[PDB]
Amino acid sequence: PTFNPPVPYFGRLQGGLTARRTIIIKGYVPPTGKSFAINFKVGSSGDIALHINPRMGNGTVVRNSLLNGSWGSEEKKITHNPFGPGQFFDLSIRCGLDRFKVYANGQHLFDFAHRLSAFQRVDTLEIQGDVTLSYVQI
Ligand SMILES: O=S(=O)(O)O[C@H]1[C@@H](O)[C@@H](CO)O[C@@H](O[C@H]2[C@H](O)[C@@H](O)[C@H](O)O[C@@H]2CO)[C@@H]1O
């Protein structure tokens, strides 16, 4: 469902992941949470074009890709962490031509350049772990 979807969330992306297409994830980080992930995925159990992994322990926002069975290099740099314990967040993820463009609460969070080149192949949004979702628009 679009409203209060229970985690783990599986929502399929109509026509594949198109360019110009924005996904909205509004949610809540529990105080007793350590890790959650947002996965843009080729098939229900395949390649992860974009893996996004807020980790509360060290307060990192880990971006990576899982391609051909292996994790590439992590990108960690941010100017802010909206996923602090007990915080609500409003994420806007836009699939661009050369990058994903990611905003949290209206503030730019990260860009992640496509490594899975043909980003169209992505057909599965996957959210898992320590997060409470209030609204998910694909
Ligand atoms: O969903 S999982 O693939 O099972 O979880 C892993 C992912 O979040 C990837 C993304 O890069 O990280 C894996 O672990 C890392 C960890 O970030 C790093 O600190 C450590 O030194 O290397 C790992 C790989 O062995 C997660 O397990």
Side-chain angles (χ1 to χ4, degrees), residues 1-124:
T2 296
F3 276 79
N4 291 294
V7 178
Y9 170 97
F10 300 96
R12 73 201 58 254
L13 277 38
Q14 172 50 242
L17 184 69
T18 325
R20 322 205 80 260
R21 180 167 170 168
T22 311
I23 293 87
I24 310 163
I25 299 166
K26 300 203 67 150
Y28 174 77
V29 177
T32 60
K34 295 283 100 200
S35 171
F36 78 95
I38 305 165
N39 287 342
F40 286 94
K41 213 168 178 195
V42 188
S44 46
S45 61
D47 281 342
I48 301 161
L50 172 53
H51 172 81
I52 313 161
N53 185 210
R55 310 176 169 164
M56 287 89 248
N58 54 13
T60 54
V61 184
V62 168
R63 294 87 63 187
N64 207 346
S65 290
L66 185 69
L67 308 172
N68 310 303
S70 69
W71 286 114
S73 297
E74 287 175 0
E75 293 169 51
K76 283 172 74 202
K77 297 217 226 167
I78 45 162
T79 50
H80 56 112
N81 195 328
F83 313 103
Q87 287 283 316
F88 287 93
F89 64 80
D90 183 348
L91 291 187
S92 178
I93 302 158
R94 185 168 91 73
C95 185
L97 279 166
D98 302 348
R99 63 203 153 283
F100 289 92
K101 299 162 188 242
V102 178
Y103 286 72
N105 307 328
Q107 287 193 20
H108 181 260
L109 184 64
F110 64 81
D111 292 350
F112 188 86
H114 294 302
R115 304 177 187 186
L116 195 160
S117 185
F119 57 81
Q120 206 81 352
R121 293 205 283 163
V122 166
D123 55 42
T124 306

